[PDB]
Design an enzyme around this catalytic site. Structure first.
Site, PDB file in Angstrom:
ATOM      1  CE1 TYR A  54      46.196  50.982  38.331  1.00  0.00           C
ATOM      2  CE2 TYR A  54      45.426  49.010  37.187  1.00  0.00           C
ATOM      3  CZ  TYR A  54      46.407  49.683  37.910  1.00  0.00           C
ATOM      4  OH  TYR A  54      47.594  49.046  38.201  1.00  0.00           O
TER       5      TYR A  54
ATOM      6  CG  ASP B  72      39.088  51.887  40.106  1.00  0.00           C
ATOM      7  OD1 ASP B  72      39.756  51.129  40.834  1.00  0.00           O
ATOM      8  OD2 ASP B  72      38.424  52.848  40.547  1.00  0.00           O
TER       9      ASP B  72
ATOM     10  NE  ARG C 294      46.076  46.100  43.199  1.00  0.00           N
ATOM     11  CZ  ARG C 294      47.326  46.310  42.795  1.00  0.00           C
ATOM     12  NH1 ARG C 294      47.704  45.927  41.582  1.00  0.00           N
ATOM     13  NH2 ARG C 294      48.200  46.900  43.603  1.00  0.00           N
TER      14      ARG C 294
ATOM     15  NE  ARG D 158      37.369  40.997  37.976  1.00  0.00           N
ATOM     16  CZ  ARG D 158      38.241  41.408  38.894  1.00  0.00           C
ATOM     17  NH1 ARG D 158      37.827  41.762  40.105  1.00  0.00           N
ATOM     18  NH2 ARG D 158      39.525  41.513  38.585  1.00  0.00           N
TER      19      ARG D 158
ATOM     20  CG  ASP E 228      47.448  42.209  34.668  1.00  0.00           C
ATOM     21  OD1 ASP E 228      48.151  42.286  35.703  1.00  0.00           O
ATOM     22  OD2 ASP E 228      46.323  41.666  34.642  1.00  0.00           O
TER      23      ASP E 228
ATOM     24  CD  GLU F 263      38.849  34.552  42.290  1.00  0.00           C
ATOM     25  OE1 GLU F 263      39.583  35.352  41.666  1.00  0.00           O
ATOM     26  OE2 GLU F 263      38.905  34.410  43.529  1.00  0.00           O
TER      27      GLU F 263
ATOM     28  CG  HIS G 186      47.573  35.841  37.054  1.00  0.00           C
ATOM     29  ND1 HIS G 186      48.413  36.710  37.719  1.00  0.00           N
ATOM     30  CD2 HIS G 186      46.317  36.150  37.460  1.00  0.00           C
ATOM     31  CE1 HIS G 186      47.697  37.503  38.496  1.00  0.00           C
ATOM     32  NE2 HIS G 186      46.423  37.184  38.357  1.00  0.00           N
ATOM     33  CB  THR G 187      51.426  37.917  31.934  1.00  0.00           C
ATOM     34  OG1 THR G 187      50.191  38.219  31.267  1.00  0.00           O
ATOM     35  CG2 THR G 187      52.065  36.722  31.263  1.00  0.00           C
TER      36      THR G 187
HETATM   37  O1  LIG Z   1      42.952  50.330  41.418  1.00  0.00           O
HETATM   38  C1  LIG Z   1      42.856  49.401  40.608  1.00  0.00           C
HETATM   39  C2  LIG Z   1      43.897  48.242  40.404  1.00  0.00           C
HETATM   40  C3  LIG Z   1      43.499  47.251  39.331  1.00  0.00           C
HETATM   41  N1  LIG Z   1      42.290  47.349  38.566  1.00  0.00           N
HETATM   42  C4  LIG Z   1      41.947  46.342  37.505  1.00  0.00           C
HETATM   43  O2  LIG Z   1      41.406  45.155  38.087  1.00  0.00           O
HETATM   44  C5  LIG Z   1      42.133  43.970  37.645  1.00  0.00           C
HETATM   45  C6  LIG Z   1      43.013  43.537  38.864  1.00  0.00           C
HETATM   46  O3  LIG Z   1      44.288  43.222  38.362  1.00  0.00           O
HETATM   47  P1  LIG Z   1      45.717  43.669  38.726  1.00  0.00           P
HETATM   48  O4  LIG Z   1      46.083  44.199  40.062  1.00  0.00           O
HETATM   49  O5  LIG Z   1      46.736  43.016  37.813  1.00  0.00           O
HETATM   50  O6  LIG Z   1      45.561  42.272  39.511  1.00  0.00           O
HETATM   51  P2  LIG Z   1      46.659  41.204  40.009  1.00  0.00           P
HETATM   52  O7  LIG Z   1      47.351  40.560  38.844  1.00  0.00           O
HETATM   53  O8  LIG Z   1      47.484  41.949  40.989  1.00  0.00           O
HETATM   54  O9  LIG Z   1      45.794  40.055  40.675  1.00  0.00           O
HETATM   55  C7  LIG Z   1      42.862  44.429  36.347  1.00  0.00           C
HETATM   56  O10 LIG Z   1      42.016  44.358  35.176  1.00  0.00           O
HETATM   57  C8  LIG Z   1      43.148  45.893  36.623  1.00  0.00           C
HETATM   58  O11 LIG Z   1      43.291  46.702  35.458  1.00  0.00           O
HETATM   59  C9  LIG Z   1      41.374  48.412  38.784  1.00  0.00           C
HETATM   60  O12 LIG Z   1      40.313  48.510  38.123  1.00  0.00           O
HETATM   61  N2  LIG Z   1      41.701  49.353  39.769  1.00  0.00           N
HETATM   62 MN   LIG Z   2      46.619  40.990  36.819  1.00  0.00          MN
END
Ligand SMILES: O=c1ccn([C@@H]2O[C@H](COP(=O)(O)OP(=O)(O)O)[C@@H](O)[C@H]2O)c(=O)[nH]1
Ligand SMILES: [Mn+2]
Ligand SMILES: O=c1ccn([C@@H]2O[C@H](COP(=O)(O)OP(=O)(O)O)[C@@H](O)[C@H]2O)c(=O)[nH]1
Ligand SMILES: [Mn+2]
Lengths: 241, 245
Positions: free
Chosen positions: A12, A41, A72, A77, A104, A191, A218-219
């Protein structure tokens, strides 16, 4: 003959997006037979993402779906899952493995080598999840998954993070109606909502030396401070970051 | 093809292996690159030793511990960058006449491949825009029609000698070897003046070489990694401490 790894990455628009996609692409560029399924997104494909993908030379498919408390990236997906089913026939002959990789996380190259041979569903340890240094599937001396080494709800059907498993494409095509749950989703149960429909615990294939090594992390990336931009903006808004 | 000596200070903490792993994955694409990894520790750690060996990258693994006392105004990684500067000077003769460029790359930033090709041709000192620094989307050198840097587009002290982040410049190796006494200021350093402390002893504004499409493009990002939450580990620990993460 080398199976294709379909990497599903929801993404996103936010400041650090280009940076995340850049270091992720730099990792993926090392992986042969890789298909990067990027789902934005957003109400439409953005030029930032379109240009970045185009310039890498990687094999990709750029999709988009806007999310209207569901996890998120879920709708993104799910769109990728439907796209796979519309693109490849149930009992096709093109071998593939599906991996849901958030933009991330940090991925080692060994991770992809490990998941490429996935027959049904493979699993491995994931660092920085569940409030631990890492979560890992519990594997017995025979090499079978018999449980999960976690603190948060250790008895969920599949107590594992999104980055900790891969699925042979054949299973995805066969279970054509299996999608990630978005409605009644429990804490860390998403999951399981999918895996439960695809495979049973005893059929899981433990990777990373019987789940004793960490190959994925999980950075999380800190939000940049843009206070000096003020209310009027200081930098050029047309300069892409 | 000039050698790019990438100086990277690093220290032991939870996300270290991950940081070095994704950085290595980027560096692996760059030809003629020498990774000078300097650990902030009393001795070379097995984690870093093994990772560097397994990457297949050309590297030199050094180490110097920043006195515990010093961590309790000394910029992070200072002693480590200075150690690398000294190592370069002790390894390459003053008149080495060997093509090379030095770049101080922290282990948490994000680097594009194009960045390295931009800096590889540096004759003196090159500069470019850097995202997420100075409380801005990005800081960028300001260039005049003659192609010379004449200032800096920043909000924080834009009038300092060199208003630029560590990730925004590279130095010709010969220049480093020539100015043998030039090191980053250890302590006292006014916030945001560390880069100037070194650069002022190496070059003048007029000798800077603007890169990245005349400083109109962002090729490097000052990203920062969140601290992992280990609350469920408890006081006695949950996971195996022998398992390397
Ligand atoms: O409004 C949003 C927030 C996150 N993401 C994506 O969905 C995944 C969710 O990860 P992120 O919030 O880091 O997840 P977290 O580490 O908080 O579990 C990542 O690929 C994000 O780029 C998205 O598509 N839309
Ligand atoms: Mn993440
Ligand atoms: O005790 C320490 C803290 C940091 N560093 C390293 O020095 C640089 C400083 O970066 P970090 O604090 O992120 O810097 P910031 O982003 O805060 O400017 C990075 O390569 C670190 O790995 C180090 O060697 N020792
Ligand atoms: Mn940093």
């Amino acid at each position: 003959a080398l199976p294709t790894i379909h990497v599903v990455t929801p993404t996103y628009s936010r400041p650090v997006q280009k940076a995340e996609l850049t270091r992720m692409a730099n990792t993926l560029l090392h992986v042969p037979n890789l298909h990067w399924l990027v789902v934005e997104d957003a109400p439409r494909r953005t030029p930032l993402t379109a240009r970045l993908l185009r310039d890498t030379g990687l094999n990709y498919t750029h999709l988009h779906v806007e999310t209207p408390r569901i996890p998120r990236g879920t709708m993104q997906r799910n769109l990728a899952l439907r796209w796979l089913r519309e693109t490849f026939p149930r009992n096709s002959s093109q071998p593939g493995v599906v991996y849901f990789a958030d933009d991330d996380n940090t991925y080692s190259l060994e991770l992809f080598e490990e998941m490429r041979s996935t027959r049904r569903v493979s699993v491995w340890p994931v660092a920085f999840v569940g409030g631990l240094r890492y979560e890992a599937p519990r594997v017995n001396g025979a090499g079978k998954v018999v449980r999960w080494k976690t603190v948060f709800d250790p008895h969920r059907p599949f107590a594992i993070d999104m980055a900790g498993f891969a699925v042979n494409l054949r299973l995805i095509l066969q279970r054509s109606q299996a999608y990630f749950k978005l409605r009644g989703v429990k804490g860390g149960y998403q999951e399981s909502s999918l895996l439960r429909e695809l495979v049973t615990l005893n059929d899981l294939e433990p990777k990373a030396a019987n789940c004793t090594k960490i190959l994925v992390w999980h950075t999380r990336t800190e939000k940049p401070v843009l206070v000096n931009e003020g209310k009027k903006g200081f930098t050029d808004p047309s300069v892409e970051i």
